Structure formats: C-alpha cells, structure tokens
Amino acid sequence: YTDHIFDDYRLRVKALEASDNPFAKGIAYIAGEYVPLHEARIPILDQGFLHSDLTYDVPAVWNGRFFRLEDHLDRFEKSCAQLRLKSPLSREEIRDRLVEMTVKSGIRDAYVMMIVTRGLRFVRQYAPEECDNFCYLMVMPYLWVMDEATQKNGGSAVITRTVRRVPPGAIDPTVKNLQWGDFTRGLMEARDRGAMYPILTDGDANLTEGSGFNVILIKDGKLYTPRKGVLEGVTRKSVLAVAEKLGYPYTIDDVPVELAYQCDEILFVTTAGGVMPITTLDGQPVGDGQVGPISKALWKGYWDAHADPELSFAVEDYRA
Amino acid sequence: MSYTDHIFDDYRLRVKALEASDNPFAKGIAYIAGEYVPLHEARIPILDQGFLHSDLTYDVPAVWNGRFFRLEDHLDRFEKSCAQLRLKSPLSREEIRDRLVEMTVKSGIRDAYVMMIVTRGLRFVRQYAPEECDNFCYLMVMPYLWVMDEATQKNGGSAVITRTVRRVPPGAIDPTVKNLQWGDFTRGLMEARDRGAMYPILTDGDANLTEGSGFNVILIKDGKLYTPRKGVLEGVTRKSVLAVAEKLGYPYTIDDVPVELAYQCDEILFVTTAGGVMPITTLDGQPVGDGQVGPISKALWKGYWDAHADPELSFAVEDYRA
Numbered sequence: 103y104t105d106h107i108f109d110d111y112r113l114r115v116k117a118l119e120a121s122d123n124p125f126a127k128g129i130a131y132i133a134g135e136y137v138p139l140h141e142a143r144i145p146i147l148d149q150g151f152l153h154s155d156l157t158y159d160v161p162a163v164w165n166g167r168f169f170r171l172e173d174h175l176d177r178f179e180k181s182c183a184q185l186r187l188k189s190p191l192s193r194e195e196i197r198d199r200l201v202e203m204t205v206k207s208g209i210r211d212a213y214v215m216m217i218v219t220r221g222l223r224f225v226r227q228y229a230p231e232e233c234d235n236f237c238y239l240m241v242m243p244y245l246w247v248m249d250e251a252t253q254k255n256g257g258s259a260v261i262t263r264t265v266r267r268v269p270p271g272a273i274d275p276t277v278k279n280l281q282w283g284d285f286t287r288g289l290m291e292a293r294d295r296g297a298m299y300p301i302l303t304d305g306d307a308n309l310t311e312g313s314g315f316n317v318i319l320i321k322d323g324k325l326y327t328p329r330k331g332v333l334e335g336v337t338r339k340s341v342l343a344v345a346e347k348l349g350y351p352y353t354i355d356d357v358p359v360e361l362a363y364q365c366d367e368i369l370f371v372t373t374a375g376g377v378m379p380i381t382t383l384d385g386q387p388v389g390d391g392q393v394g395p396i397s398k399a400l401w402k403g404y405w406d407a408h409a410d411p412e413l414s415f416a417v418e419d420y421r422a
Numbered sequence: 423m424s425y426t427d428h429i430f431d432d433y434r435l436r437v438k439a440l441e442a443s444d445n446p447f448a449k450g451i452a453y454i455a456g457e458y459v460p461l462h463e464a465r466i467p468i469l470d471q472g473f474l475h476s477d478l479t480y481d482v483p484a485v486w487n488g489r490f491f492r493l494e495d496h497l498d499r500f501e502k503s504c505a506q507l508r509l510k511s512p513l514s515r516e517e518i519r520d521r522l523v524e525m526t527v528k529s530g531i532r533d534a535y536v537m538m539i540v541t542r543g544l545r546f547v548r549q550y551a552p553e554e555c556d557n558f559c560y561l562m563v564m565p566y567l568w569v570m571d572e573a574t575q576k577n578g579g580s581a582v583i584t585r586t587v588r589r590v591p592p593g594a595i596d597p598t599v600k601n602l603q604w605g606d607f608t609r610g611l612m613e614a615r616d617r618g619a620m621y622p623i624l625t626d627g628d629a630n631l632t633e634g635s636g637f638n639v640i641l642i643k644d645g646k647l648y649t650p651r652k653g654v655l656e657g658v659t660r661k662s663v664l665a666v667a668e669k670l671g672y673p674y675t676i677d678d679v680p681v682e683l684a685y686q687c688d689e690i691l692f693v694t695t696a697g698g699v700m701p702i703t704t705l706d707g708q709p710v711g712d713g714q715v716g717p718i719s720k721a722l723w724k725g726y727w728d729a730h731a732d733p734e735l736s737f738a739v740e741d742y743r744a
C-alpha cells in the first residue's frame with residue numbers, strides 16, 4: 103500500500119540529490135538573511151538556547167503542496183501568545199517567506215520549521231513585553247520518524263516504565279516546545295528494551311503521546327486517542343477527519359493504559375512521516391502483528407488529502 | 423551600617439576597573455569548536471540538538487576576586503550529569519578546567535559567571551544510539567550575574583509560592599541533572615511578576631516546596647534550617663551554606679519541606695552560584711517573620727562569602743598552572 107505515494111516520492115528525492123542548488127540540502131532565514139541550512143548559526147546568548155525559551159511549529163510540503171499551513175500558523179500564534187512571545191514577523195510575513203524559501207530551495211517534499219525565541223533578554227530581569235523576540239525559519243528535505251521500509255510492516259514501541267510525561271501544570275503540552283527531557287529518556291528506554299519508539303503515560307494510568315507524535319488506538323472499528331497531556335496534532339486532526347468520511351467512530355478522551363494491550367491496531371501520527379503503524383508493543387504483537395485494514399484506509403485517506411485544494415496549495419500558484 | 427558592604431564595596435571597585443578595560447574579552451569569552459570568540463559574537467549551529475531538543479546538561483561555577491570557588495564540586499556534578507544523559511564531553515575534565523582558567527585570565531574578569539555545556543551534537547537519539555553521537559562542548563566566561571543584586575539583598579527580596587505552575591516531577595525530568603528545560607521556572611517567573619513579586623517558589627504539586635528559577639530554598643525556624651531533598655538540584659551553594667551552618671552550630675535537615683512551613687518560618691534564604699545567599703523578606707505579599715533580614719541569614723551570608731578565600735575550597739586563577 104506504500105507504493106501509492108513512495109514511488110513518486112523516491113523519484114523527487116533522486117532529482118533533489120542531483121541538484122547543484124546550494125539550498126537543496128535546506129535553507130534557513132536568520133536575521134533577514136537566507137543561509138544554507140548546514141552553515142546556519144544562532145547566537146549562543148539566544149534564550150531559545152540558554153533556557154529553551156521558545157515555541158515552534160512544523161508544517162510539511164508534499165509534491166510541492168503545503169498541507170494545512172493555516173492550521174499550523176493558527177496553532178503557532180496560539181503557542182506564541184501562551185508564552186507571551188510576539189513574532190517579529192507577521193503571520194502573513196512567515197507564510198510569504200516559507201513559500202519563497204521552498205521555491206528558492208527547489209525542495210518539493212519538505213520538513214518546515216517556524217521558531218520564536220525570547221531573544222537575548224530573559225524574563226527574570228525584564229518583563230516579557232520588554233523582550234525583543236527572535237524568529238527563525240527553516241526548510242529542509244522531508245524527515246521520516248518512520249520510513250517507507252518500516253511502515254510496510256509497522257514499527258515497535260513500549261509503554262515507558264522508567265519515565266512519565268511532563269504534566270501540563272508544569273509545561274503546557276498544547277504549546278509545541280523543544281523541552282524533550284521526558285521524550286529523550288523515553289527514546290533511550292525504548293532502545294534499552296529493543297523497541298524503536300516510546301509511548302509515555304501521564305503517571306495516572308492513561309496514555310499521552312510519544313517523542314514527536316500522537317497515538318491512536320483502534321479496537322472493534324473505533325479510534326481512541328488521548329485528549330489531555332498531549333499536543334493537539336494537525337496529523338491527528340487530519341486522520342480523524344478521514345475517519346469521519348469513512349464512517350469510523352472516534353473519541354478524543356482519556357485512554358487508559360489497559361486499552362493499549364487489548365486493541366486491534368496502533369497508529370502513531372505526526373507531520374514528519376504521516377500515518378505510522380505500530381505492530382509490536384512491549385515485545386508482543388499488536389493484535390495479529392499485521393498492519394491492520396483501518397490503518398491502511400486512514401493512511402490512504404491522509405495522503406489522498408494532500409491534493410485536496412481546501413487543505414493544500416501548490417507553491418508556484420501562491421502569490422505574496 | 424549595611425551588612426552587604428562586607429563584599430560589595432570591594433566588588434563595586436573591581437567592576438569599575440573592568441568596565442574601563444579595553445580587553446576585547448572583558449565582556450566575556452566563549453570556547454566554540456577549538457576557537458576563543460568574544461561572547462557577544464559567539465554562535466552555535468542551529469542544527470545543534472542542544473537547541474532542537476534542549477538535549478544537553480551544563481554546570482555553573484563562579485570566580486570571585488580572582489578565585490574559583492568549589493570548581494571541583496561543579497566538575498564532579500557536571501561529569502555525573504553527563505553520564506546520566508549518556509553524554510561524553512569531547513574535552514576531558516582536565517581540559518575543561520585548564521581552558522576555564524585560561525579564558526578567565528585571558529578575559530581579565532575578577533568576578534565571573536562561568537558555564538560548561540555539553541550537547542548531543544548534530545545527531546538525535548531516535549535514529550542513532552547515544553554512543554553513535556559526537557557530543558559538543560561549549561565553555562563561556564562572563565561578568566558575574568546577580569539573581570538578587572546588592573540593593574535587594576540589603577532589605578531582602580519578594581517571592582510567591584506558585585499556584586499556576588508546579589515543578590516538573592523527577593520521573594519526567596531528573597532535577598539532579600542540571601538542565602535548561604525551564605518551561606516550569608519560566609511560567610513561575612511570569613506568575614511572580616503578575617503577582618507583584620520578584621521570584622517564584624515552585625511546589626512539587628503534592629503540598630511540598632521544591633526550588634525556584636535557578637536557586638535552592640532554605641527555611642529557617644527556631645534556629646534550624648529546612649531545605650527540600652527531592653525534586654531539586656543538589657546545589658553547591660546549598661552545600662556551602664549547610665557546611666557554614668554545621669560549623670556555626672545551626673542544625674539543618676535535608677528532607678520534605680511541607681508548604682505550610684513557608685508561612686510559619688522566621689527567615690527564608692534563596693541560594694545559587696549566581697548571587698550567593700539571597701534573603702527573602704516578603705512571601706505572597708506578607709512579611710517573612712518580622713519583615714527584616716534575620717540574624718541567621720546574615721551569619722550564613724558572611725560565612726559563605728568568607729569561605730571564597732579558604733585555600734581548600736578555592737584557588738587564585740593566577741597561581742593555577744595547566
């Protein structure tokens with residue numbers, strides 16, 4: 103079922119790797135300058151580094167079409183407000199520059215980043231309103247949390263037992279952030295236990311999310327995905343809209359840990375890879391150990407949606 | 423006659439001298455990829471996982487009147503922190519020490535805030551085993567920073583026990599491993615400002631006190647010191663103040679500190695490398711005890727700073743040799 107998109111994608115990557123464009127390996131916007139991604143540098147005094155004082159968002163370009171960029175911009179502006187950050191670049195400026203950098207790079211399948219940091223001033227010495235916040239933009243070749251090869255059979259995960267999710271009353275998980283202390287411990291625990299990915303609990307016997315992805319349990323034809331303690335993922339939104347069209351019931355609510363061990367299918371969903379089936383959990387098969395039919399149908403709907411003119415636009419039909 | 427003059431008179435003179443210096447490193451110096459760079463020109467690659475996933479640990483010793491204080495304790499904790507996160511410094515312990523002293527002498531700074539950082543580097547631990555990652559080391563020496571300045575120490579600072587945020591629990595992020603994932607502390611600083619206070623004190627969300635944004639907390643009641651054990655960094659400043667407390671005959675306990683005790687204590691100290699002993703005289707808009715900097719705070723303050731000359735716990739940067 104992967105050939106549906108990956109045959110065409112592999113052709114586009116071949117063309118990009120053959121390109122002599124100095125931005126084909128990626129492009130960064132830093133202080134009004136476009137720089138090749140691997141030469142791009144930020145000041146070490148940026149509080150985005152010295153206190154991870156930032157928020158970010160990651161839309162994708164697929165076959166030269168941005169997917170749900172307005173949803174990512176909406177969530178980014180919301181995230182900025184929650185942390186009392188104000189982007190020096192307008193929402194409309196960010197959109198214009200992200201499209202320009204995509205065209206300028208020639209990258210047709212892109213992992214895109216918009217970052218706002220506190221700047222050089224910290225919020226102990228200064229009110230947030232007295233801080234001049236920084237904006238960084240990056241466009242790079244599309245990244246896969248789960249690659250084609252792994253998606254064909256599904257990946258492996260564990261419910262972490264050495265680490266639990268940062269609670270929202272400490273750090274708000276609806277505000278996309280790079281304070282991955284728990285997720286990083288999770289990835290190490292997964293490798294220790296011979297699995298690719300962690301699923302973190304809330305420390306109260308419910309599932310939350312993983313290292314850069316939401317979790318969807320499928321049982322008896324119904325989708326179950328955590329409400330609290332997680333990022334409100336754009337991939338999750340897309341997959342649930344596809345589920346609605348196909349007549350699959352879903353609920354965004356508490357997901358008790360027990361349900362992970364009794365379900366038929368598990369999906370991980372994220373911008374960086376899309377729909378990512380999981381067929382091993384804690385060393386045991388998920389259901390029959392096969393990529394399930396509902397996973398396949400949602401995978402197809404998700405990718406088909408990247409041509410939907412209501413949800414996407416082509417990078418050349420765009421005008422500032 | 424103010425008790426703060428004991429150190430600030432001499433320090434205000436030394437800064438004046440430094441602000442007159444033409445040395446291009448007098449504003450600070452960074453080690454980046456085997457090069458010394460002026461601090462305000464120093465840059466790191468945007469793809470450093472120290473940035474893209476705050477995948478790092480750090481430590482902060484200080485230089486005072488040209489003497490490093492307890493640098494070996496900071497190096498000990500840094501190596502422990504690196505091991506916990508499966509980071510290996512590309513610079514040995516001995517190289518970090520040599521370079522930190524070199525950068526201090528080269529800068530001419532007599533009162534410095536020092537920073538040793540190790541990040542994951544350009545590879546992340548999803549695609550790669552941690553042993554496959556070539557980790558980066560960054561060093562910085564800059565003019566000494568004050569979480570609480572001279573003016574505030576004279577009458578004491580203001581704090582609140584946070585009610586809009588709690589501390590990241592140890593089973594999410596290990597607080598004994600010094601890290602820059604300040605999501606909770608940053609919320610705390612914003613809440614403090616909203617409530618007309620300088621500093622936050624975060625609870626563990628289970629009715630105990632933890633630490634604040636870059637400092638440990640010590641309560642003092644009926645001559646006894648109480649400081650949280652769990653949910654906090656094991657501060658070198660806290661260690662020093664407790665040694666000064668043991669030597670002066672003040673009993674102390676490192677254990678759970680229930681929130682209630684904050685409202686019933688006689689004195690409150692915040693302790694950190696970036697400011698030292700920092701008395702707190704207002705809590706949730708009300709006086710701490712009699713609203714004055716207390717006698718035990720002053721005694722511990724004096725002992726802490728006096729110990730920056732002790733030859734067993736400090737060394738002069740000029741007398742050091744690689």
Ligand SMILES: Cc1ncc(COP(=O)(O)O)c(C=O)c1O
Nearest residue numbers: 314315316333335336337372373
């Ligand atoms: C913690 C976390 N959860 C979930 C996601 C996926 O959400 P989205 O589909 O909006 O990328 C990400 C994104 O990388 C993430 O960092």
Ligand SMILES: Cc1ncc(COP(=O)(O)O)c(C=O)c1O
Nearest residue numbers: 636637638655657658659694695
């Ligand atoms: C969270 C936290 N606790 C405690 C401290 C104090 O540790 P030390 O006294 O060793 O500097 C700091 C210093 O920055 C800190 O960030």
Ligand SMILES: [Cl-]
Nearest residue numbers: 329354355356
């Ligand atoms: Cl719910």
